[PDB]
Amino acid sequence: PAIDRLLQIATGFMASKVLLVAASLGLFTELAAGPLRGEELRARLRLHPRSARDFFDTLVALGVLERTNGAYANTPATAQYLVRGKSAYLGGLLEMSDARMYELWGRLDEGLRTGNPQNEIRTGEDPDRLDAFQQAMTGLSMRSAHALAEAIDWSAYRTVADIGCAEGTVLIHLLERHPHLRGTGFDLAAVRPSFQRRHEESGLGDRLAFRAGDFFAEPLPQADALVFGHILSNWALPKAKTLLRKAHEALPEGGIVVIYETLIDDERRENVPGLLMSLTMLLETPGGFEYTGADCREWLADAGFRESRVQYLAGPESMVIATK
Amino acid sequence: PAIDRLLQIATGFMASKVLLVAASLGLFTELAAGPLRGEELRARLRLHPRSARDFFDTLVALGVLERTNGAYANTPATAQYLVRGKSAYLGGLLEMSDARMYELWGRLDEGLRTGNPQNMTGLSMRSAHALAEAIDWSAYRTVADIGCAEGTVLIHLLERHPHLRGTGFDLAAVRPSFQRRHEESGLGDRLAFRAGDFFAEPLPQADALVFGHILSNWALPKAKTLLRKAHEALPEGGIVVIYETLIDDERRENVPGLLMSLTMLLETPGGFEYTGADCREWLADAGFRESRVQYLAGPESMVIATK
Ligand SMILES: [Cl-]
């Protein structure tokens, strides 16, 4: 029945917390080398004997652990993605959800009533957990980057600029996939060291450059293609529109702007991740918001772009592409 | 792939809170009289204009609201089960989850590290109805519900089977709530309340003793003591009826039961969820002649034993 599905979604915070805490404990990393009996896994995690077995068995019933003759083991997915120290490790997303986002969403009611963010802005304010979270975000960025490299005919362009490039994961992957491209990452000066470390590791050399700048205070770098990944959604609409104006001014005739986000579907009735992201923007920012491709096409029209289209990218991400 | 499903479970707290807040706001009750435009719904719920439309459309995308021409309406399921003031209302679970359980589960890690705890009528109805249908109550004349609370389950049993005489047993402080339901039922002298502490005195004698979500609240030695006392209270051929959100015997499949065991960790000093096989062992040690486990109502199962 529909009511049963509704109640299951409504009480999903419990199964969520089980996985989140297992990630914070590094449970799957403890099992990386091989299976462990419950008592040994309990001892290594410093858990109390009252509920350790219940906890491990809940993970089994959720399908994220195996158990064979009393020995717990990783599933394929947890061995691949939830073991610390592997390049594919995504558990940092769960560690930060456990440490911060679960309680932030506990303030949804106050966010909805006040329209105000409920995070550190409301309060006026672990390095290894930050690093793990950044690794997971770099992994998600990589999925978008792999899709972006195939979703656009990059042979039509010689130069690309990523606006708000952070450590430069997307730009680096684009350049590695398309050796004819030259790239410029644009971000605040504080981002330079993290970007340049990835630049060094990539071996791209002079094909990649970093430009320090504040995109709300200075012009954008000229390039054939400008990329805005999860940029416009952080700001109220008038600020987003100034960026589209700057993008139009930085591009040549025939150049493109590529905007990607966890877009809501145009009818605002299908895309759960995009709509949940709009509530995340409520909780995290003073004026940020998630939008639809149709919304963005309107803004791009106002900014003078000749044409535009909406295109699926990968996972929860989609993009709007416009031509000057 | 499996990692995508895993991530969806892990981030399930978000869609959960959307539904929990909708229940706490009484949103579905506001739509009970008919569809409302978003501005009208926002105004009636006193939500800020920044994110009200986002919130309403999240409910639409989750499949719990309908929307056309900018007007929001209940789905059949929320119209039937999430409107307050109706006997069918199941939203109490969501209101209590929003007010208490979401934050309590926020302390799951401290519960796991320490072993220490970290801390509505419609919810018992499905099990109450099934209990009256799943047992041949014609074989018995008297029944006692041990830990009867406000008496919902026992009252329904007596209404369904007019030949039965019933005793609700609970702490003295429960009597006012029980009396209210007792008066409303019209059962009269066929139903009685008996005040007592089942860890301090014998249980009421009856042909059948019912333990609905009782044993799981207490440490195993105390649960075993209650089963001993049940055996002492019953006649030859009498039955003990236990029902719980049991974990499966192999402890690898029943997510509701396993989650309930973690809820018992967070809420009680000694409670735990258990399996049917567990309970049958306890029942044998307490002297019961035979026992069986049966599915009762969805995630609820019952264990029955004969003296
Ligand atoms: Cl063991």
Author numbering:
A (entry chain B): 12 to 136, 146 to 344
B (entry chain A): 12 to 130, 157 to 344
Quoted passage from the original study:
Among bisindoles, reductasporine is distinct due to its dimethylpyrrolinium structure. Its previously reported biosynthetic gene cluster encodes two unique tailoring enzymes, the imine reductase RedE and the dimethyltransferase RedM, which were shown to produce reductasporine from a common bisindole intermediate in recombinant E. coli. RedE reduces compound 4 to didemethylreductasporine, and then RedM catalyzes two methylations to give reductasporine. RedM is a homodimeric protein with monomers consisting of a largely α-helical N-terminal domain (α1-10, β1-3) and a Rossmann-like fold C-terminal domain (α12–16, β4-10) bridged by a long interdomain α-helix (α11). The C-terminal domain possesses a Rossmann-like fold typical of Class I SAM-dependent methyltransferases, with a β-sheet of five parallel strands terminated with two antiparallel strands each interspersed with α-helices.
To provide insight into the N,N-dimethylation catalyzed by RedM, we solved the structure of selenomethionine-labeled RedM, and used this model to solve crystal structures of unliganded enzyme, as well as a co-crystal structure with SAH and a co-crystal structure with SAM, all to 1.7 to 1.85 Å resolution. The homodimers of both unliganded-RedM and RedM-SAH structures superpose well on each other (rmsdCα = 0.175 Å, 553 Cα) and comparatively poorly upon the RedM-SAM homodimer (rmsdCα = 1.244 Å, 593 Cα) due to a substantial displacement of the C-terminal Rossmann-like SAM-binding domain. Lastly, Chain B of the RedM-SAH complex and unliganded-RedM chain A have slightly rotated Rossman-like domains compared to their dimer partners with an average Cα displacement of 1.8 Å between each pair. The two domains of each monomer are separated by a gap of ∼12 amino acids between residues ∼132 and ∼144 ahead of the long interdomain α-helix (α11), which lacks clear electron density in each structure. Each RedM structure has a disordered region around residues 133 to 149, which includes the analogous position (Y140).
